[PDB]
Amino acid sequence: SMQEKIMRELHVKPSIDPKQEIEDRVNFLKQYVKKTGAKGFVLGISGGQDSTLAGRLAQLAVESIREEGGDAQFIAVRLPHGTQQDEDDAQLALKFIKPDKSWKFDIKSTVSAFSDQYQQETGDQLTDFNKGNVKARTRMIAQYAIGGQEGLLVLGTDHAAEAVTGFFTKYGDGGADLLPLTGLTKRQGRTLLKELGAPERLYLKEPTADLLDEKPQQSDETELGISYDEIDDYLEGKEVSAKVSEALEKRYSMTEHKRQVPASMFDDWWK
Amino acid sequence: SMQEKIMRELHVKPSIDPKQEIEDRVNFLKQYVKKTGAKGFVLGISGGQDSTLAGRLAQLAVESIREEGGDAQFIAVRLPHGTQQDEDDAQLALKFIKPDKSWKFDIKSTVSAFSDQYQQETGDQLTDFNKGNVKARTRMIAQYAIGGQEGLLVLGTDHAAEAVTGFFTKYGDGGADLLPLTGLTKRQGRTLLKELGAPERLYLKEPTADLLDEKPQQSDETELGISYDEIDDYLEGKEVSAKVSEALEKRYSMTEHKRQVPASMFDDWWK
Numbered sequence: 001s002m003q004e005k006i007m008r009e010l011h012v013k014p015s016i017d018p019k020q021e022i023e024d025r026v027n028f029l030k031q032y033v034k035k036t037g038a039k040g041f042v043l044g045i046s047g048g049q050d051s052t053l054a055g056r057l058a059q060l061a062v063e064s065i066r067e068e069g070g071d072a073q074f075i076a077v078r079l080p081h082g083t084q085q086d087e088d089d090a091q092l093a094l095k096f097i098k099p100d101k102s103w104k105f106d107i108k109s110t111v112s113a114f115s116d117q118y119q120q121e122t123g124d125q126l127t128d129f130n131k132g133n134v135k136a137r138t139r140m141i142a143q144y145a146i147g148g149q150e151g152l153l154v155l156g157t158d159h160a161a162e163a164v165t166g167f168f169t170k171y172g173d174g175g176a177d178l179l180p181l182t183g184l185t186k187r188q189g190r191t192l193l194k195e196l197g198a199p200e201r202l203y204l205k206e207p208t209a210d211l212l213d214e215k216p217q218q219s220d221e222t223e224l225g226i227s228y229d230e231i232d233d234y235l236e237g238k239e240v241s242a243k244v245s246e247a248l249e250k251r252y253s254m255t256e257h258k259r260q261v262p263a264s265m266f267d268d269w270w271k
Numbered sequence: 272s273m274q275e276k277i278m279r280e281l282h283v284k285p286s287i288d289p290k291q292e293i294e295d296r297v298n299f300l301k302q303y304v305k306k307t308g309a310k311g312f313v314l315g316i317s318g319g320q321d322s323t324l325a326g327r328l329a330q331l332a333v334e335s336i337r338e339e340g341g342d343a344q345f346i347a348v349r350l351p352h353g354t355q356q357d358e359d360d361a362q363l364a365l366k367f368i369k370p371d372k373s374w375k376f377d378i379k380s381t382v383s384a385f386s387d388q389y390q391q392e393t394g395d396q397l398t399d400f401n402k403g404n405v406k407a408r409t410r411m412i413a414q415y416a417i418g419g420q421e422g423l424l425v426l427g428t429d430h431a432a433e434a435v436t437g438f439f440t441k442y443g444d445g446g447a448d449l450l451p452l453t454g455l456t457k458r459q460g461r462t463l464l465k466e467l468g469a470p471e472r473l474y475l476k477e478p479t480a481d482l483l484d485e486k487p488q489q490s491d492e493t494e495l496g497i498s499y500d501e502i503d504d505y506l507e508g509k510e511v512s513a514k515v516s517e518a519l520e521k522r523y524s525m526t527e528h529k530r531q532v533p534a535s536m537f538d539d540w541w542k
């Protein structure tokens with residue numbers, strides 16, 4: 001089945017044991033860092049569900065490593081573009097995560113400079129959509145810079161519900177070293193957050209990429225036109241409307257390039 | 272055999288037919304663009320060998336596309352960080368490539384704006400090494416912005432002699448849509464340029480990533496500690512000294528991460 005194939009490719013489980021998922025995902029983080037000899041992790045904290053979940057798992061992983069007499073640290077970093085409208089949630093996220101270090105890097109001046117030079121060289125203004133993708137790539141650079149200066153791995157927040165739709169920026173939030181949330185559906189992620197003792201405000205929060213200047217904090221589902229719950233039912237193998245399965249299936253193939261290393265002539269996935 | 276496994280993973284032919292290689296690679300470019308319905312390609316033209324070769328292939332593919340009655344175009348772009356020391360070679364490359372459009376985007380103001388914020392936020396100054404990586408990722412953003420504005424795909428110039436040593440910036444120049452030079456060694460590449468009639472200056476100069484301010488135009492061979500000729504003999508399946516094989520193989524395993532999508536607990540390669 002196409003749905004069965006996707007489920008298997010994305011590593012989704014129809015049902016999970018939240019306590020055990022948390023243990024294994026924290027152990028993955030611990031084992032990876034130790035194998036590489038890295039000094040910890042860095043992650044951009046948005047105030048959204050996924051980063052809040054991934055950020056707490058990272059914090060639990062570095063605490064465990066030190067308990068074992070190792071040395072590891074977690075740097076949480078806010079990356080607003082000027083004034084973030086839901087900064088309050090970010091601040092709440094931080095209180096809940098309790099990271100070893102909380103940094104900040106406002107990306108407005110870089111993005112501005114980039115924009116101004118674009119129009120000056122080409123005579124065109126960047127569209128809102130293209131500017132939104134510049135913002136997402138700038139956050140990548142910012143995280144890689146901190147990671148580079150401090151000897152840390154960059155965590156990525158991709159999970160099955162964002163993966164199936166290719167809903168992330170190529171080499172932007174998609175640019176990361178490791179993925180602790182792989183295989184989890186949106187609802188399964190909320191379950192994990194609930195078991196961790198997270199504030200309800202962080203997991204009943206409407207998912208948003210908030211990249212646009214013309215339409216702040218726009219909802220994922222709006223941009224998508226399918227509900228995350230429909231998405232979760234499909235991935236968890238529940239039966240859904242054919243109108244649902246076909247639109248999901250089509251977007252998945254169309255976004256395969258985001259899930260693979262750059263194409264060459266020796267690759268067949270694209271043919 | 273380790274050498275033999277690398278050769279196969281990297282797609283290297285111990286022996287090639289240059290005219291056939293040219294045809295295959297120009298056809299892959301035409302095949303991809305038709306499948307995806309993209310309008311053409313964009314690529315950064317450095318004045319070094321690799322970008323000169325890829326740029327010429329690209330130009331040939333779009334001219335061939337337009338001959339069969341299709342529509343496709345090629346934008347060649349200069350990405351100097353202020354004044355590029357070998358700008359003269361880059362101008363010579365454009366003259367050989369003969370692209371449909373040649374644009375320019377100076378990344379210096381974006382890089383300075385970034386470095387300045389870094390220091391304002393962290394109180395630290397970027398190392399020359401880390402700043403060099405910001406230049407590379409900024410060039411990626413520039414190309415993806417032009418591609419986004421115009422509807423084009425981003426070509427990347429990675430080839431086997433760069434892949435084997437992980438000599439490219441992750442999500443910097445490693446960030447692209449498709450790779451026309453995959454499997455070619457440095458010398459095989461020179462052979463293709465000789466077949467296409469390129470100016471000798473373009474493949475006689477020393478390869479350099481030129482990302483550093485403190486040590487501009489530093490040659491790869493200096494950074495690497497091995498020459499491109501020892502690298503090519505290894506890749507080509509020739510019996511090299513124990514000292515080349517050791518160094519190469521050590522370097523390859525340490526950079527595997529640059530050659531896979533981000534690691535998850537479900538991947539085995541990292542264990």
Ligand SMILES: Nc1ncnc2c1ncn2[C@@H]1O[C@H](COP(=O)(O)OP(=O)(O)OP(=O)(O)O)[C@@H](O)[C@H]1O
Nearest residue numbers: 133166168169170171257307418419423424425448
């Ligand atoms: N089939 C393809 N193969 C390889 N690269 C592709 C393909 N289709 C598009 N691309 C590249 O990917 C970019 C789009 O990816 P990006 O991460 O920006 O998603 P987005 O534009 O934010 O949203 P959308 O999901 O609507 O594409 C394009 O501008 C192009 O460079």
Ligand SMILES: Nc1ncnc2c1ncn2[C@@H]1O[C@H](COP(=O)(O)OP(=O)(O)OP(=O)(O)O)[C@@H](O)[C@H]1O
Nearest residue numbers: 036147148152153154177404437438439440441528
């Ligand atoms: N084993 C690993 N797994 C995943 N990511 C890693 C691993 N080792 C390093 N990294 C990440 O890769 C980055 C290094 O890649 P990058 O392109 O920046 O290379 P570089 O430092 O310019 O050159 P080199 O890596 O050859 O010294 C590090 O900042 C870190 O975030």
Ligand SMILES: Nc1ncnc2c1ncn2[C@@H]1O[C@H](COP(=O)(O)O)[C@@H](O)[C@H]1O
Nearest residue numbers: 044045046051078079080157173208209
């Ligand atoms: N304003 C922000 N501040 C910090 N990190 C951010 C910000 N926006 C996005 N991120 C990062 O980008 C990832 C993807 O966001 P999203 O598109 O909402 O799924 C988040 O999980 C964060 O790690």
Ligand SMILES: Nc1ncnc2c1ncn2[C@@H]1O[C@H](COP(=O)(O)O)[C@@H](O)[C@H]1O
Nearest residue numbers: 315316317322349350351428444479480
């Ligand atoms: N000064 C530059 N101008 C334009 N493109 C460049 C520049 N430097 C690097 N690039 C691009 O980056 C790729 C990698 O360069 P290199 O590290 O020299 O192998 C090149 O093949 C170009 O496509």
Ligand SMILES: [Mg+2]
Nearest residue numbers: 048050157162
């Ligand atoms: Mg998210």
Ligand SMILES: [Mg+2]
Nearest residue numbers: 319321428433
């Ligand atoms: Mg090169």
